[PDB]
mmCIF file of all heavy atoms in Angstrom:
data_model
loop_
_atom_site.group_PDB
_atom_site.id
_atom_site.type_symbol
_atom_site.label_atom_id
_atom_site.label_comp_id
_atom_site.label_asym_id
_atom_site.label_seq_id
_atom_site.Cartn_x
_atom_site.Cartn_y
_atom_site.Cartn_z
ATOM 1 N N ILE V 3 143.368 -43.744 46.092
ATOM 2 C CA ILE V 3 144.735 -43.751 45.743
ATOM 3 C C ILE V 3 144.879 -44.138 44.350
ATOM 4 O O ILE V 3 146.099 -44.183 43.872
ATOM 5 C CB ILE V 3 145.471 -44.869 46.692
ATOM 6 C CG1 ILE V 3 144.837 -46.293 46.461
ATOM 7 C CG2 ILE V 3 145.400 -44.587 48.113
ATOM 8 C CD1 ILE V 3 145.468 -47.263 47.427
ATOM 9 N N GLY V 4 143.837 -44.382 43.557
ATOM 10 C CA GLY V 4 144.017 -44.450 42.194
ATOM 11 C C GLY V 4 142.682 -44.360 41.470
ATOM 12 O O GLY V 4 141.606 -44.593 42.101
ATOM 13 N N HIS V 5 142.576 -43.986 40.177
ATOM 14 C CA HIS V 5 141.416 -44.037 39.455
ATOM 15 C C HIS V 5 141.632 -44.432 38.041
ATOM 16 O O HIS V 5 142.702 -44.081 37.368
ATOM 17 C CB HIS V 5 140.802 -42.587 39.448
ATOM 18 C CG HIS V 5 141.547 -41.572 38.850
ATOM 19 N ND1 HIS V 5 142.545 -40.886 39.451
ATOM 20 C CD2 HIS V 5 141.524 -41.121 37.528
ATOM 21 C CE1 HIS V 5 143.106 -39.930 38.474
ATOM 22 N NE2 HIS V 5 142.553 -40.048 37.432
ATOM 23 N N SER V 6 140.611 -45.061 37.381
ATOM 24 C CA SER V 6 140.864 -45.433 36.018
ATOM 25 C C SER V 6 139.443 -45.575 35.469
ATOM 26 O O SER V 6 138.428 -45.810 36.180
ATOM 27 C CB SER V 6 141.481 -46.865 35.898
ATOM 28 O OG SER V 6 140.740 -47.874 36.621
ATOM 29 N N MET V 7 139.178 -45.386 34.132
ATOM 30 C CA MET V 7 137.895 -45.527 33.474
ATOM 31 C C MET V 7 137.939 -46.784 32.695
ATOM 32 O O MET V 7 138.835 -47.113 31.906
ATOM 33 C CB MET V 7 137.737 -44.316 32.527
ATOM 34 C CG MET V 7 136.455 -44.283 31.746
ATOM 35 S SD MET V 7 136.172 -42.734 31.106
ATOM 36 C CE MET V 7 137.519 -42.511 30.014
ATOM 37 N N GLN V 8 136.923 -47.672 32.892
ATOM 38 C CA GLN V 8 136.707 -48.824 32.156
ATOM 39 C C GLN V 8 135.318 -48.750 31.421
ATOM 40 O O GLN V 8 134.270 -48.810 32.057
ATOM 41 C CB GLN V 8 136.724 -50.141 33.029
ATOM 42 C CG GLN V 8 136.415 -51.351 32.253
ATOM 43 C CD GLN V 8 136.463 -52.670 33.129
ATOM 44 O OE1 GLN V 8 136.354 -52.488 34.306
ATOM 45 N NE2 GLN V 8 136.708 -53.828 32.534
ATOM 46 N N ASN V 9 135.392 -48.504 30.082
ATOM 47 C CA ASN V 9 134.215 -48.304 29.354
ATOM 48 C C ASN V 9 133.454 -47.141 29.967
ATOM 49 O O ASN V 9 134.017 -46.014 30.197
ATOM 50 C CB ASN V 9 133.303 -49.606 29.175
ATOM 51 C CG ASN V 9 134.073 -50.671 28.573
ATOM 52 O OD1 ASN V 9 134.660 -50.475 27.469
ATOM 53 N ND2 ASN V 9 134.283 -51.924 29.286
ATOM 54 N N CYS V 10 132.147 -47.356 30.505
ATOM 55 C CA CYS V 10 131.391 -46.291 31.016
ATOM 56 C C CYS V 10 131.411 -46.280 32.491
ATOM 57 O O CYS V 10 130.726 -45.502 33.056
ATOM 58 C CB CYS V 10 129.987 -46.389 30.472
ATOM 59 S SG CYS V 10 129.872 -46.083 28.740
ATOM 60 N N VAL V 11 132.288 -46.986 33.193
ATOM 61 C CA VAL V 11 132.349 -46.933 34.635
ATOM 62 C C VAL V 11 133.709 -46.414 35.091
ATOM 63 O O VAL V 11 134.733 -46.531 34.415
ATOM 64 C CB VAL V 11 132.077 -48.191 35.481
ATOM 65 C CG1 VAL V 11 130.584 -48.641 35.188
ATOM 66 C CG2 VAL V 11 133.010 -49.356 34.990
ATOM 67 N N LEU V 12 133.675 -45.736 36.195
ATOM 68 C CA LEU V 12 134.960 -45.267 36.886
ATOM 69 C C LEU V 12 135.190 -46.254 37.975
ATOM 70 O O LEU V 12 134.374 -46.790 38.715
ATOM 71 C CB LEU V 12 134.657 -43.932 37.452
ATOM 72 C CG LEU V 12 135.912 -42.851 37.442
ATOM 73 C CD1 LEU V 12 136.329 -42.708 35.978
ATOM 74 C CD2 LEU V 12 135.185 -41.520 37.881
ATOM 75 N N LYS V 13 136.537 -46.697 38.112
ATOM 76 C CA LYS V 13 137.045 -47.507 39.141
ATOM 77 C C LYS V 13 138.045 -46.812 39.968
ATOM 78 O O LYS V 13 139.087 -46.398 39.575
ATOM 79 C CB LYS V 13 137.808 -48.712 38.469
ATOM 80 C CG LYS V 13 136.815 -49.642 37.806
ATOM 81 C CD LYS V 13 137.360 -51.050 37.421
ATOM 82 C CE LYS V 13 138.632 -50.826 36.650
ATOM 83 N NZ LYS V 13 138.752 -52.013 35.633
ATOM 84 N N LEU V 14 137.590 -46.506 41.273
ATOM 85 C CA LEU V 14 138.429 -45.863 42.167
ATOM 86 C C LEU V 14 139.012 -46.736 43.200
ATOM 87 O O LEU V 14 138.299 -47.484 43.850
ATOM 88 C CB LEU V 14 137.450 -44.729 42.960
ATOM 89 C CG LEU V 14 136.684 -43.838 42.004
ATOM 90 C CD1 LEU V 14 135.734 -42.973 42.919
ATOM 91 C CD2 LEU V 14 137.542 -43.014 41.190
ATOM 92 N N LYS V 15 140.298 -46.797 43.183
ATOM 93 C CA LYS V 15 140.979 -47.614 44.074
ATOM 94 C C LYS V 15 141.104 -46.896 45.406
ATOM 95 O O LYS V 15 141.411 -45.571 45.435
ATOM 96 C CB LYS V 15 142.357 -48.012 43.589
ATOM 97 C CG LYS V 15 143.280 -48.830 44.435
ATOM 98 C CD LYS V 15 142.934 -50.158 44.359
ATOM 99 C CE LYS V 15 144.267 -50.984 44.341
ATOM 100 N NZ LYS V 15 145.306 -50.424 45.153
ATOM 101 N N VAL V 16 140.735 -47.595 46.483
ATOM 102 C CA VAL V 16 140.663 -46.989 47.835
ATOM 103 C C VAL V 16 141.710 -47.798 48.673
ATOM 104 O O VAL V 16 142.147 -48.917 48.406
ATOM 105 C CB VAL V 16 139.357 -46.945 48.451
ATOM 106 C CG1 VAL V 16 138.428 -45.922 47.728
ATOM 107 C CG2 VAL V 16 138.699 -48.262 48.489
ATOM 108 N N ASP V 17 142.108 -47.203 49.762
ATOM 109 C CA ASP V 17 143.139 -47.764 50.586
ATOM 110 C C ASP V 17 142.634 -48.742 51.661
ATOM 111 O O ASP V 17 143.404 -49.356 52.459
ATOM 112 C CB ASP V 17 143.991 -46.593 51.360
ATOM 113 C CG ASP V 17 143.095 -45.855 52.373
ATOM 114 O OD1 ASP V 17 141.857 -46.135 52.398
ATOM 115 O OD2 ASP V 17 143.726 -45.177 53.106
ATOM 116 N N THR V 18 141.312 -48.988 51.695
ATOM 117 C CA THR V 18 140.692 -49.884 52.658
ATOM 118 C C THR V 18 139.789 -50.901 51.863
ATOM 119 O O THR V 18 139.102 -50.457 50.967
ATOM 120 C CB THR V 18 139.831 -49.016 53.559
ATOM 121 O OG1 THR V 18 140.603 -48.240 54.322
ATOM 122 C CG2 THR V 18 139.115 -50.017 54.631
ATOM 123 N N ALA V 19 140.021 -52.259 52.118
ATOM 124 C CA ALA V 19 139.048 -53.174 51.577
ATOM 125 C C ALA V 19 137.749 -53.098 52.393
ATOM 126 O O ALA V 19 137.802 -52.902 53.608
ATOM 127 C CB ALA V 19 139.569 -54.488 51.739
ATOM 128 N N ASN V 20 136.669 -53.139 51.757
ATOM 129 C CA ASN V 20 135.304 -53.141 52.282
ATOM 130 C C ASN V 20 135.190 -54.458 53.165
ATOM 131 O O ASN V 20 135.163 -55.441 52.773
ATOM 132 C CB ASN V 20 134.161 -53.116 51.337
ATOM 133 C CG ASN V 20 132.766 -53.022 52.017
ATOM 134 O OD1 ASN V 20 132.608 -53.018 53.190
ATOM 135 N ND2 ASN V 20 131.868 -52.850 51.167
ATOM 136 N N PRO V 21 135.150 -54.275 54.587
ATOM 137 C CA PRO V 21 134.964 -55.403 55.492
ATOM 138 C C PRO V 21 133.777 -56.094 55.256
ATOM 139 O O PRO V 21 133.576 -57.294 55.695
ATOM 140 C CB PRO V 21 135.039 -54.661 56.842
ATOM 141 C CG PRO V 21 134.612 -53.378 56.706
ATOM 142 C CD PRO V 21 135.061 -52.860 55.326
ATOM 143 N N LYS V 22 132.744 -55.545 54.596
ATOM 144 C CA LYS V 22 131.353 -56.149 54.333
ATOM 145 C C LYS V 22 131.362 -56.721 52.931
ATOM 146 O O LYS V 22 130.251 -57.037 52.502
ATOM 147 C CB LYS V 22 130.319 -55.190 54.580
ATOM 148 C CG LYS V 22 130.130 -54.685 55.997
ATOM 149 C CD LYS V 22 129.104 -53.591 56.244
ATOM 150 C CE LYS V 22 129.195 -52.860 57.575
ATOM 151 N NZ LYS V 22 128.333 -51.720 57.615
ATOM 152 N N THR V 23 132.456 -56.869 52.278
ATOM 153 C CA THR V 23 132.465 -57.402 50.830
ATOM 154 C C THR V 23 131.729 -58.759 50.899
ATOM 155 O O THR V 23 132.464 -59.698 51.602
ATOM 156 C CB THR V 23 133.847 -57.326 50.235
ATOM 157 O OG1 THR V 23 134.358 -56.039 50.343
ATOM 158 C CG2 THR V 23 133.649 -57.914 48.871
ATOM 159 N N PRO V 24 130.728 -59.042 50.265
ATOM 160 C CA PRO V 24 130.211 -60.339 50.156
ATOM 161 C C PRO V 24 130.917 -61.166 49.117
ATOM 162 O O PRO V 24 131.840 -60.591 48.253
ATOM 163 C CB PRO V 24 128.772 -60.120 49.606
ATOM 164 C CG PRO V 24 128.843 -58.967 48.704
ATOM 165 C CD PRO V 24 129.915 -57.971 49.342
ATOM 166 N N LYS V 25 130.813 -62.480 49.035
ATOM 167 C CA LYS V 25 131.167 -63.251 47.868
ATOM 168 C C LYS V 25 130.349 -62.726 46.710
ATOM 169 O O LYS V 25 129.245 -62.533 46.795
ATOM 170 C CB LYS V 25 130.995 -64.720 48.025
ATOM 171 C CG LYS V 25 131.756 -65.546 46.957
ATOM 172 C CD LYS V 25 133.075 -64.913 46.566
ATOM 173 C CE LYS V 25 133.678 -65.524 45.346
ATOM 174 N NZ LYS V 25 133.077 -65.095 44.041
ATOM 175 N N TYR V 26 131.146 -62.381 45.587
ATOM 176 C CA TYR V 26 130.345 -61.774 44.445
ATOM 177 C C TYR V 26 131.065 -62.106 43.099
ATOM 178 O O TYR V 26 132.166 -62.583 43.035
ATOM 179 C CB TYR V 26 130.470 -60.236 44.586
ATOM 180 C CG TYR V 26 131.811 -59.586 44.236
ATOM 181 C CD1 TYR V 26 132.081 -59.047 43.072
ATOM 182 C CD2 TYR V 26 132.830 -59.432 45.378
ATOM 183 C CE1 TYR V 26 133.250 -58.454 42.756
ATOM 184 C CE2 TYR V 26 133.894 -58.836 45.093
ATOM 185 C CZ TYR V 26 134.228 -58.354 43.879
ATOM 186 O OH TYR V 26 135.462 -57.733 43.636
ATOM 187 N N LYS V 27 130.281 -61.983 42.023
ATOM 188 C CA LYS V 27 130.651 -62.115 40.623
ATOM 189 C C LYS V 27 130.029 -60.861 39.957
ATOM 190 O O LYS V 27 129.099 -60.314 40.280
ATOM 191 C CB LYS V 27 130.326 -63.448 40.016
ATOM 192 C CG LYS V 27 130.680 -64.554 40.671
ATOM 193 C CD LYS V 27 130.153 -65.819 39.926
ATOM 194 C CE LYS V 27 130.069 -66.961 40.932
ATOM 195 N NZ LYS V 27 129.232 -68.077 40.235
ATOM 196 N N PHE V 28 130.803 -60.523 38.809
ATOM 197 C CA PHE V 28 130.202 -59.642 37.840
ATOM 198 C C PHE V 28 129.690 -60.439 36.664
ATOM 199 O O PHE V 28 130.400 -61.104 35.984
ATOM 200 C CB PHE V 28 131.225 -58.645 37.263
ATOM 201 C CG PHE V 28 131.648 -57.590 38.362
ATOM 202 C CD1 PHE V 28 132.727 -56.676 38.054
ATOM 203 C CD2 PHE V 28 130.948 -57.356 39.592
ATOM 204 C CE1 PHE V 28 133.000 -55.714 38.923
ATOM 205 C CE2 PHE V 28 131.302 -56.468 40.454
ATOM 206 C CZ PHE V 28 132.321 -55.663 40.221
ATOM 207 N N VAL V 29 128.353 -60.229 36.314
ATOM 208 C CA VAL V 29 127.773 -60.966 35.206
ATOM 209 C C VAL V 29 127.027 -60.029 34.433
ATOM 210 O O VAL V 29 126.573 -59.037 34.738
ATOM 211 C CB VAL V 29 126.719 -62.003 35.883
ATOM 212 C CG1 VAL V 29 125.723 -62.568 34.939
ATOM 213 C CG2 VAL V 29 127.427 -62.945 36.756
ATOM 214 N N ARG V 30 127.066 -60.401 33.018
ATOM 215 C CA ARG V 30 126.286 -59.665 32.012
ATOM 216 C C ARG V 30 125.149 -60.572 31.755
ATOM 217 O O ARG V 30 125.209 -61.655 31.265
ATOM 218 C CB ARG V 30 127.089 -59.496 30.743
ATOM 219 C CG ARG V 30 126.372 -58.525 29.776
ATOM 220 C CD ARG V 30 127.277 -58.074 28.661
ATOM 221 N NE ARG V 30 126.446 -57.284 27.736
ATOM 222 C CZ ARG V 30 126.282 -56.056 27.788
ATOM 223 N NH1 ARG V 30 126.834 -55.368 28.753
ATOM 224 N NH2 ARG V 30 125.552 -55.364 26.848
ATOM 225 N N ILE V 31 123.916 -60.081 32.035
ATOM 226 C CA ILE V 31 122.659 -60.960 31.873
ATOM 227 C C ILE V 31 122.189 -60.806 30.502
ATOM 228 O O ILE V 31 122.566 -59.922 29.719
ATOM 229 C CB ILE V 31 121.621 -60.519 32.939
ATOM 230 C CG1 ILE V 31 121.185 -59.082 32.843
ATOM 231 C CG2 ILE V 31 122.035 -60.966 34.328
ATOM 232 C CD1 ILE V 31 119.904 -58.715 33.550
ATOM 233 N N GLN V 32 121.291 -61.645 30.119
ATOM 234 C CA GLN V 32 120.601 -61.775 28.854
ATOM 235 C C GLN V 32 119.371 -60.934 28.978
ATOM 236 O O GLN V 32 118.653 -60.962 29.993
ATOM 237 C CB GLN V 32 120.416 -63.184 28.408
ATOM 238 C CG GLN V 32 121.606 -63.906 28.165
ATOM 239 C CD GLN V 32 122.444 -63.345 27.001
ATOM 240 O OE1 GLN V 32 122.002 -63.454 25.836
ATOM 241 N NE2 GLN V 32 123.657 -62.747 27.378
ATOM 242 N N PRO V 33 118.802 -60.574 27.750
ATOM 243 C CA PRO V 33 117.457 -59.909 27.695
ATOM 244 C C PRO V 33 116.369 -60.955 28.177
ATOM 245 O O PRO V 33 116.568 -62.196 27.795
ATOM 246 C CB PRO V 33 117.264 -59.469 26.276
ATOM 247 C CG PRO V 33 118.265 -60.285 25.539
ATOM 248 C CD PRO V 33 119.485 -60.450 26.500
ATOM 249 N N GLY V 34 115.438 -60.470 28.836
ATOM 250 C CA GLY V 34 114.469 -61.360 29.538
ATOM 251 C C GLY V 34 114.782 -61.924 30.871
ATOM 252 O O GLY V 34 113.877 -62.498 31.578
ATOM 253 N N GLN V 35 116.056 -61.799 31.287
ATOM 254 C CA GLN V 35 116.489 -62.226 32.660
ATOM 255 C C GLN V 35 116.036 -61.200 33.738
ATOM 256 O O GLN V 35 115.812 -60.006 33.313
ATOM 257 C CB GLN V 35 117.926 -62.531 32.711
ATOM 258 C CG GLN V 35 118.364 -63.844 32.089
ATOM 259 C CD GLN V 35 119.782 -64.186 32.404
ATOM 260 O OE1 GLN V 35 120.877 -63.755 31.712
ATOM 261 N NE2 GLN V 35 119.965 -64.950 33.473
ATOM 262 N N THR V 36 115.832 -61.644 34.955
ATOM 263 C CA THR V 36 115.402 -60.730 35.914
ATOM 264 C C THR V 36 116.462 -60.467 36.923
ATOM 265 O O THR V 36 117.419 -61.234 37.083
ATOM 266 C CB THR V 36 114.062 -61.264 36.734
ATOM 267 O OG1 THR V 36 114.463 -62.608 37.128
ATOM 268 C CG2 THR V 36 113.013 -61.355 35.653
ATOM 269 N N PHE V 37 116.369 -59.415 37.792
ATOM 270 C CA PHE V 37 117.244 -59.074 38.837
ATOM 271 C C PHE V 37 116.498 -58.121 39.762
ATOM 272 O O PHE V 37 115.412 -57.549 39.491
ATOM 273 C CB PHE V 37 118.545 -58.499 38.320
ATOM 274 C CG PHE V 37 118.318 -57.255 37.393
ATOM 275 C CD1 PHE V 37 118.491 -55.974 37.908
ATOM 276 C CD2 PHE V 37 118.083 -57.459 36.003
ATOM 277 C CE1 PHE V 37 118.389 -54.819 37.177
ATOM 278 C CE2 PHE V 37 118.023 -56.216 35.243
ATOM 279 C CZ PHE V 37 118.071 -55.015 35.766
ATOM 280 N N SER V 38 117.210 -57.995 40.983
ATOM 281 C CA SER V 38 116.644 -57.082 41.954
ATOM 282 C C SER V 38 117.496 -55.780 41.943
ATOM 283 O O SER V 38 118.617 -55.751 41.761
ATOM 284 C CB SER V 38 116.835 -57.609 43.381
ATOM 285 O OG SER V 38 115.905 -58.731 43.553
ATOM 286 N N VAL V 39 116.705 -54.628 42.064
ATOM 287 C CA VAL V 39 117.370 -53.292 42.088
ATOM 288 C C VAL V 39 117.374 -52.779 43.487
ATOM 289 O O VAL V 39 116.260 -52.699 44.084
ATOM 290 C CB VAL V 39 116.775 -52.368 41.052
ATOM 291 C CG1 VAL V 39 117.250 -50.853 41.409
ATOM 292 C CG2 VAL V 39 116.961 -52.830 39.613
ATOM 293 N N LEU V 40 118.502 -52.318 44.021
ATOM 294 C CA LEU V 40 118.474 -51.619 45.273
ATOM 295 C C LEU V 40 118.537 -50.134 44.830
ATOM 296 O O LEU V 40 119.740 -49.670 44.588
ATOM 297 C CB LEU V 40 119.666 -52.079 46.161
ATOM 298 C CG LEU V 40 119.699 -51.396 47.557
ATOM 299 C CD1 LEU V 40 118.622 -51.677 48.304
ATOM 300 C CD2 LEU V 40 120.940 -51.686 48.340
ATOM 301 N N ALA V 41 117.518 -49.374 44.903
ATOM 302 C CA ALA V 41 117.457 -47.931 44.621
ATOM 303 C C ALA V 41 118.035 -47.252 45.813
ATOM 304 O O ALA V 41 117.752 -47.405 47.029
ATOM 305 C CB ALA V 41 116.139 -47.449 44.346
ATOM 306 N N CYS V 42 119.066 -46.304 45.506
ATOM 307 C CA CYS V 42 119.801 -45.658 46.410
ATOM 308 C C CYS V 42 119.977 -44.232 46.034
ATOM 309 O O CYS V 42 120.010 -43.818 44.971
ATOM 310 C CB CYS V 42 121.283 -46.215 46.556
ATOM 311 S SG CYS V 42 121.357 -47.731 47.240
ATOM 312 N N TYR V 43 120.062 -43.378 47.202
ATOM 313 C CA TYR V 43 120.444 -41.896 47.039
ATOM 314 C C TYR V 43 121.421 -41.508 48.027
ATOM 315 O O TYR V 43 121.348 -41.932 49.181
ATOM 316 C CB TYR V 43 119.020 -41.142 47.217
ATOM 317 C CG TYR V 43 118.022 -41.521 46.097
ATOM 318 C CD1 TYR V 43 117.195 -42.647 46.447
ATOM 319 C CD2 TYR V 43 118.027 -40.884 44.891
ATOM 320 C CE1 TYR V 43 116.348 -42.934 45.457
ATOM 321 C CE2 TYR V 43 117.098 -41.342 43.928
ATOM 322 C CZ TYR V 43 116.208 -42.349 44.241
ATOM 323 O OH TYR V 43 115.247 -42.788 43.298
ATOM 324 N N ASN V 44 122.396 -40.704 47.518
ATOM 325 C CA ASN V 44 123.514 -40.311 48.427
ATOM 326 C C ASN V 44 124.128 -41.551 49.147
ATOM 327 O O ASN V 44 124.591 -41.354 50.258
ATOM 328 C CB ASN V 44 122.980 -39.210 49.393
ATOM 329 C CG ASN V 44 122.489 -38.004 48.736
ATOM 330 O OD1 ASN V 44 121.306 -37.695 48.890
ATOM 331 N ND2 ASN V 44 123.251 -37.391 48.003
ATOM 332 N N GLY V 45 124.289 -42.639 48.525
ATOM 333 C CA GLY V 45 124.979 -43.771 49.125
ATOM 334 C C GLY V 45 123.998 -44.477 50.053
ATOM 335 O O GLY V 45 124.480 -45.479 50.592
ATOM 336 N N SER V 46 122.827 -44.175 50.200
ATOM 337 C CA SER V 46 121.867 -44.703 51.267
ATOM 338 C C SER V 46 120.664 -45.467 50.602
ATOM 339 O O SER V 46 120.077 -44.861 49.622
ATOM 340 C CB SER V 46 121.272 -43.714 52.211
ATOM 341 O OG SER V 46 122.401 -43.129 52.911
#
């Protein structure tokens, strides 16, 4: 139901809230910090 570009990401507004949305934050990490990657293909 809407779309916008924020820097290098697209933000698509949808008509349904994800029922599985976890508690979350967006963080910019520092070089040297670690994180887990979930590698995905076709949304899976």
Side-chain angles (χ1 to χ4, degrees):
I3 61 181
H5 66 272
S6 62
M7 182 165 61
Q8 177 177 20
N9 302 305
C10 289
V11 294
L12 220 51
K13 291 195 300 216
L14 310 172
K15 177 83 133 38
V16 292
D17 66 351
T18 298
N20 184 354
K22 299 175 190 173
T23 301
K25 195 32 192 83
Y26 74 95
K27 303 182 211 163
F28 288 171
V29 169
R30 194 171 169 89
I31 57 164
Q32 293 298 293
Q35 289 192 268
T36 57
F37 55 96
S38 292
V39 169
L40 181 67
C42 288
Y43 302 86
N44 298 119
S46 296

